[PDB]
């Protein structure tokens, strides 16, 4: 680009879109579970990972991963979601915060308890 060309049209930056649009620049967001189900990961991984469609207070419905082993989440449950995609689950871009609101902590957890909402044993 010549200076004259740049005079006519300046250098343009990038949009830099977010990977967590539903949060709307918020650390966490409350929501209600519309369907708690399981899905299979894409190749090469293999399992039955647990997910839940959740309608946010902002009015966005998004699939959020329920981390840990076992969950007390049923339909019509008030949960707090946060940012964090699941690489092998296409579409899942959010993670439920265990131990906040209805969502209970992972039972029988002795490591990384803070990340699974488990009080000090």
């Amino acid at each position: 680009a010549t200076v004259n060309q740049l005079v006519r049209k300046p250098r343009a930056r990038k949009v830099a879109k977010s990977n967590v649009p539903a949060l709307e620049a918020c650390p966490q967001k409350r929501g209600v579970c519309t369907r708690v189900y399981t899905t299979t990961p894409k190749k090469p991984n293999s399992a039955l990972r647990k997910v839940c469609r959740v309608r946010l207070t902002n009015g966005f419905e998004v699939t959020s991963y329920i981390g840990g082993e076992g969950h007390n989440l049923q339909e019509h449950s008030v949960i707090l979601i946060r940012g964090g995609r699941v690489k092998d689950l296409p579409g899942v871009r959010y993670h439920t915060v265990r131990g906040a609101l209805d969502c209970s902590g992972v039972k029988d957890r002795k490591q990384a308890r803070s990340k699974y909402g488990v009080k000090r044993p």
């Binding site: 209600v32 049923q74 339909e75 019509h76 008030v78």
Partner: protein, 139 residues
């Protein structure tokens, strides 16, 4: 459906105000069931939701989850074969479905003799049955 959101909030508040008022969702039927100390009680609660909470709701008899069972004992063979397109898949199993004592539950028996069915495939056989039994065989 718009009221459903408001209904949730309404139930929470009502439950806090009145101890004897209870609300829960039956997982099987996927139905929120309200509990009270009488017809008059629940009537008042419902009307309060309709006005104060502005949630138009309709009450009714709680749906009942039914189960099924086999009345007769029979031996049946199940066979699969798919060689139509490229890779071929085959499997055959001879199973006897006998009525179990009520309450005992599913009791899969591996009576395979001479390894006619490979040991590795036997767990899958049970898994297949369990999944099929989870689904209705009648209604």
């Amino acid at each position: 459906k718009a009221d459903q959101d408001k209904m949730t909030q309404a139930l929470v508040k009502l439950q806090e105000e009145d101890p004897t008022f209870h609300a829960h969702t039956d997982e099987e039927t996927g139905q929120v069931i309200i509990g009270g100390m009488g017809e008059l009680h629940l009537d008042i609660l419902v009307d309060r939701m309709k006005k104060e909470f502005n949630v138009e709701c309709n009450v009714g008899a709680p749906m009942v989850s039914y189960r099924e069972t086999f009345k007769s004992s029979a031996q049946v063979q199940g066979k699969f074969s798919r060689q139509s397109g490229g890779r071929g898949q085959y499997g055959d199993v001879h199973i006897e479905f006998t009525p179990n004592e009520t309450g005992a539950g599913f009791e899969f028996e591996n009576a395979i003799v001479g390894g006619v069915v490979p040991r590795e495939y036997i767990p899958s056989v049970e898994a297949g049955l369990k999944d099929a039994m989870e689904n209705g065989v009648l209604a």
